[PDB]
Design a protein around this ligand. Sequence first.
Ligand SMILES: Cc1nc(C)c(C(=O)Nc2ccc(F)c(-c3nc4ncc(-c5ncccc5C)cn4n3)c2)o1
Lengths: 235, 214, 238, 230, 229, 202, 240, 272
Amino acid sequence: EYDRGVNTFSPEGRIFQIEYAVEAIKLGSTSLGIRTPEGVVLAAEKRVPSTLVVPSSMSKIMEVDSHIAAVMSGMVADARILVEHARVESQNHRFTYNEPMSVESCTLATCDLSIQFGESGGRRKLMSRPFGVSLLIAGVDEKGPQLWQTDPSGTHTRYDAQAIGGGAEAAQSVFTERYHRNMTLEEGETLAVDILKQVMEDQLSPENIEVAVVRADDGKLHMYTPTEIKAIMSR
Amino acid sequence: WSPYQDNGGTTAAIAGKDFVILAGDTRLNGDFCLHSRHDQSKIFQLTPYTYMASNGMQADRLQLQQMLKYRVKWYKYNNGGKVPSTKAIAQLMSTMLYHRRFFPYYTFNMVVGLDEEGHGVCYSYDAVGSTEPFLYGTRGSAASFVEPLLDCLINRQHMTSQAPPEMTKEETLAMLKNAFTGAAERDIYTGDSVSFFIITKDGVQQESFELRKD
Amino acid sequence: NEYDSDITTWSPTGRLFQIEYANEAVNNGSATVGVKGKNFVVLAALKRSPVAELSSYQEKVFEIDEHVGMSISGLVADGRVLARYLRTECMNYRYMYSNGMPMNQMADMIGEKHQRHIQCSGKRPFGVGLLLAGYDRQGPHLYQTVPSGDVYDYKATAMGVRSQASRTYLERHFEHFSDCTLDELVTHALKALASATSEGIELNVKNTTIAIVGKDTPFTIFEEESARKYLDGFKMRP
Amino acid sequence: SGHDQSTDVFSAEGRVFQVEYAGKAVDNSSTAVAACCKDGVVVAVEKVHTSRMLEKGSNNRIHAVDRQAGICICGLLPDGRAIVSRARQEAENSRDIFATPIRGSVLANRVGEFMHAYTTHFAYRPFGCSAIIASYADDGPQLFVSDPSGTVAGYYGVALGKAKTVAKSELEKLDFSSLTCDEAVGKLASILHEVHDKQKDKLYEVEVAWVCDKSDRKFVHVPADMVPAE
Amino acid sequence: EAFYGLTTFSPSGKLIQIEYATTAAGKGTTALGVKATDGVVIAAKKKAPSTLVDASSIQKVFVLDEHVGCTYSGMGPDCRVLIDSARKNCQQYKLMYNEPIPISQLVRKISAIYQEFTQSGGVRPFGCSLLVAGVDANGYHLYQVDPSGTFWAWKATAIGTGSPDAKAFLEKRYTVDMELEDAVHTALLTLKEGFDGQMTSENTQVGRVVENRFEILSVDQLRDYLDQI
Amino acid sequence: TTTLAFRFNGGIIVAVDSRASTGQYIASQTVMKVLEINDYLLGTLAGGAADCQYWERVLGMECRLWELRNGSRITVAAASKILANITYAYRNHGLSMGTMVAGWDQFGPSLYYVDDKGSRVKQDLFSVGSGSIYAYGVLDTGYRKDLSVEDACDLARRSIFHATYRDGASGGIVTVYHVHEKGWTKISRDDQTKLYHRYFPS
Amino acid sequence: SYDRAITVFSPDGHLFQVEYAQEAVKKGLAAVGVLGSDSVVIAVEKKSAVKLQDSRTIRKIYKVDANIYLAFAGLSADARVLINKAQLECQRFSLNYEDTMDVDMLVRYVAGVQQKSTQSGGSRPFGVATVIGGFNEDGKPHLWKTDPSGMCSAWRAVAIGRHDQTVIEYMEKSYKDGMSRDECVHFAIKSLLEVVESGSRNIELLVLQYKEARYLTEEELQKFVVEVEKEREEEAAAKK
Amino acid sequence: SHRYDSRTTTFSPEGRLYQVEYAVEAIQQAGTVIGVCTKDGVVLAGEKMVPHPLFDSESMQDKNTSGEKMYKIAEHIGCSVAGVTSDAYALLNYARLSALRHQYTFQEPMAIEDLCRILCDEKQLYTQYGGVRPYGVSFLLVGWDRYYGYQLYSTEPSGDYSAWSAYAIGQNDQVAHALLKKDWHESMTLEDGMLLALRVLGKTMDTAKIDLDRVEVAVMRKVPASNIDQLLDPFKHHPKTTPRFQILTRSELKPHAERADQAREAEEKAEA
Ligand SMILES: Cc1nc(C)c(C(=O)Nc2ccc(F)c(-c3nc4ncc(-c5ncccc5C)cn4n3)c2)o1
């Protein structure tokens, strides 16, 4: 329906398109992110459409840089372009300033694109709609391990433990407890895998999901292979 | 009419263990006259631990200083108040110098600052941006005077005498004063008064030193 | 009601309904209170509280230059669009005239930048209100911008959700601000701000930002670390 | 129906409804009044404060456009700011291209022309503000008014705002042939206090400007101690 | 700037905007044209809105160049656009080929604007049907373009209000071996038969192309035939 | 400037001097001519130091982007074509750079030379620079495929040392890099005069 | 120019234009591509042999690159305009890098175009879902599938076109890992024919091996369709 | 304004593009034209409107390029149009420009399948951008090339094209379909092909004793090459025979018309 435009305001003040695009997020796969003094952890459920897909092609966890990972939810068609944008901006920040970009700067550079929607072209070409995707960036820079979140609004927010996608409501319930500030990375592993176990219709299998971890001292991104996830489930 | 001009002057830095001594002569000369003897537009402070000292054309360095200052301010605003490091500033300046490659800046630059482990390092650029990190270095019309002198008292090559102890702030300051008093007596365009900047960890201090006014 | 479909449509009563809706976006943002003294201006913003172990942190206070600063309320995804522009313009001005842009000129710039977006079809008004805080030759200035494009030079103001109580407090002490000193200014601002929070919530270092800008003082933000000088001793004494 | 939704639609009787709705929004704004006193012009506007913490000098509606011409925008303040900026771009050109101060009537013509280029297109909305241009060029004192319709007209004494009829009935009885600005700054200022209702808005204040020979033919704000107290 | 299309297909497959435009292009004054082995004759009817219209200045037979004429029936203000572009395309041809443009190319060029407006963005179709006539290297021609963009190579036609009867009369009084003056006479005669009063030298306007050129008839020349029919 | 790299059974060997002369004055004796693009490619700097540094840094950004997107390391044949296109686009803007990209992709080792006019050749023996004419002489007469890694490194070091000794535009510190299937390692880095009393003793 | 937003969010968070394109896909001709051990095969529905189409052959599996073949499902004209873009991209890639485009990069570029369509002004999404098969320059057969939504994904035996879920969920429980070259041609027919009419002249098959892709001729296809129908009728006699 | 946007290029709830369906239903009322692809030529036989007593023909010199229904696109490509007449001319000019630019670039006659694709991409382009109505016209291209000999393609007002051996578009085209697929064999000469055409044409507009004012025929075959001036490019091999598209007058159709109605009465006498 096209009665109200792409830029109209609702009587409650929130733009219609961004209010609808946030609703499309709860239709996607869930995802997590836990920040800890040792590192940050990103867990997600691939939610394959069939048993035939080679699952390593629908990786919900994309590497943006050797120290910056990003997990998404919603419609994974757009999130790929946000990730290419973050990769280009991070490589530029390494080419110009000769040092790893800061995670908050990557999130800023992502929202800077995600806001540029409208209809009247004129000078610059715009997006005809917001991205129906809520990213989740995690990384390790000098400010320690950091987890940032992004909405289709263009609004970036630093967190400590967040959940996006469908089963995020009960995920925040599991969050309010079972999470102190100074946990161990293994504790984060157990907690995240438990959450995934709790809020998914499928059965948690080492090939079903995907987990990535970024450790502080190493300072590198370390995507887990199914066997390592099996090692976590066996605990 | 050519859009270029050389306003003489010279600068020279020596990096130590936990400090850097930067020095620039305060003298500005035009075509054939002498504009000023109190020119302080050589050494420009970017961040509390980083400076850029440039020679050559004066308008070009007054322009490049503002471009670098605004790039530093953008970096500070995007990174939540994180003042950039010397390494980042030096790479940024090389990138900036090469963008104006076809109508270049007529400056020869040095980005003098402190590294992360505390050690001090200097950088040196060409007109187009060939950076090279090093421990001392002079630029300007008085380069070929001061450089071989420092080469001989710091590197201590060609002397069969065990290496002396590591030079401190006062000793390095005195050595650089020697170099400038010697270069003010054989170069016609150099020296009315030099300004020294001692960059340490607990801030920076500043001193002046007076030369011959001929 | 079919006269709110566009920003370029006048209701039979001469009303722009899209802008009256955009004002509801400001009337639902996080509360902020600004207080202007004789030589200092103090902004106090109420950020989001931690959920018993976890701290969500979002930037509401911005620094625009050495002497300026702004606290936004409403949709932040517009506050950044405006802060980038204000920073760019204060830099373009400090590059030409090598001195800080006067507030009486920056407020007009913000007003025009807003108005340019409420007169075409393919646009929409910024659903964000600003609290500008500055100091220049003429002394401290505290403005407040709305979505419609207006700018108001205030003596003391407050905006955001349930900011009416903050204003009801401020409209008793706003006559003595030209004499209260810095600590007294920040205390008035915090007392006015804590009068807009929920019932069982009180002010503490976890959910408050304090920005200050004055004569010999560049714009300094204050978060948890040094907010305690103004925040650790603080009671909402009725 | 839909015949009153865009500016490019003539009604069945040849009326552009959107501009009538625009003028309806000016009919509800703060009061303004102005007098062309054969040796100068005096504009005086009512500022209705919604808040008693507002610094004096905020929301001033009288803006200088050249040395000698000024604009008082009765109506929507943001749109008046756009018109003031356009008049400033028009007055600086004649001072730049043509080395001469812009004549008052030409400025009024240009401001009207610009206000009317917004009531022809389907993608714009008419300005919600009526301008009062007070100029004193080498052609004598001039007082013009521009409505959101884009129509300009020169007056001897003009009244705008919510209370426009009773405040205009005051200007009929002034002389305007022997009236001097030095007394008009009292007369018009008192007219606004007489017409102003005070059981609706608890906060109001009168701000008046003038351009005559005493101010070196320059549009300035009145000296503070020249407006009667109430 | 309203870049979308106004005319669009309908469930029945009709560009119904074009049907409205072709009805609007048949309400104007009646014009007609006939052919003969020696030349073409165009005859319009200057319906004066009032006695204060200066019948000298209103014109319905437009010269396009030394060899082409035209007349319309519909919205005059629309036909001005097509005449102004047709003269330009007739001069651009003489500029590049140094030869009087043949009629067929002229009609293909101006029938390309009808179609460009029935398929552009934010514009409505034209509402005037032309009657082009003239000479080229391969004889005399009389075409009749339409708002939909089509064109036809008639031999004797009539457009406007009162066309279905004017063409009926033309079916009967036409002859395959007509000389030129016969054509002028029959044009004026079928205009009179449909004329509401009696036509004067300033109530009509004819143009007859003879052997190299169009040459709109003057007032005295047009009179010399009016008082002889 | 003197730069050389030759291919043998065991990998690729790069070797450089470390001096940058501005006409007749020696700017520095520690310029780093081998710009390690990534952990698998080696590019060398010859000609304009600004141009080479900048464009090889751009190429090291583009190889990293390629790896990020596809998830596989870039190959030498494609990493060398990027630089050839970059250089060929500016063939009429006055660049001055001749570089050598040497890598070990999934097709064994490859060594390309990319010029300042877009030239791009693939041979197993290169020596660019102003003292290059002194390397070839000592390089062509000792080079053969089946050299041991130390014997070939010695050939490269003794070949750069003879270019530093006869040429005024080369000298300083001779440095030798080795490119094998696991990556690359800096073999040695020695002063040009301590070599003189090591090759011609007494 | 005309750039009004067409694909906008519905009051439930559903892109009506994308769902409507994915509906126009379901009304097309099927296409079943399976992945074998050392060769990948693709089968297309070849609408009919109407005794009126030119006796000359025209193929329905399009050669996007010397080693990458494509088979679409949906609207035919948009399918051709997408194949042309892909063929231009392969040849630009093997001009900026001297290296033949892998399959995966081509799938990513085509999915990028698909997605850019659903976020541009004045353009509706392409109504095509494609299966892209091929070999890298080191063997490694790859088989990918894109959607009008732009979400590409690598499969092991995929079907597109009408009755999509039926064929997929049938041949997922009858796919053995690591089939032979003559297994695939039997497994491609036996699964595709579960949706097509028994007519043997509306099937067009392609086998694709390392550096060799040849189409299976009429009698070659008959030899296998008879074996397939016999196995199916045997499975039926086993059902009852 | 954006409220009166008809939105031509949108997907309807059932993936159907309404405007393209309406264009198809528009073409159905246009004139029927059929085209049969024989082994030594290809024929296009269509029906043009009833001749008013006052119609004239533009006295065109060299009348072999444009008839009332069939047109020439290049020396070896003819086409026939069905649908909105004045819209077909824009695409016809575009196709002429395309089939001339390829000959400017490559100096070889463009093959039918290349052009048929290059002017169907244009017809599709409007179905996806611009937001304006699509070209509501359908083609029949016939021509000869060294790649596949006599070809014959057919076009939809949606960009898709298909190669046919004998096709028909316009009024009652479902009838001519069932009639052409009824009788067409590979071993059919050109003159027997033409007999098949008119025969099934008269049946589609229901005329016994076919008429010669309401029919238009255009044949595309190879004639022996004509202007071979080998002495002006001694290294240019000119083929011995070149294709020539030719439109039939009254003097040369009447012989083929009297045999068509004679075959009609032949296959009519044997109905009892
Ligand atoms: C396969 C192969 N075989 C050879 C022999 C080469 C080769 O020569 N390639 C090459 C390409 C571009 C260049 F730009 C250069 C190049 N190298 C230089 N070294 C030093 C100075 C220099 N420096 C300071 C002062 C004066 C001078 C002359 C200048 N150049 N220019 C060399 O390639």
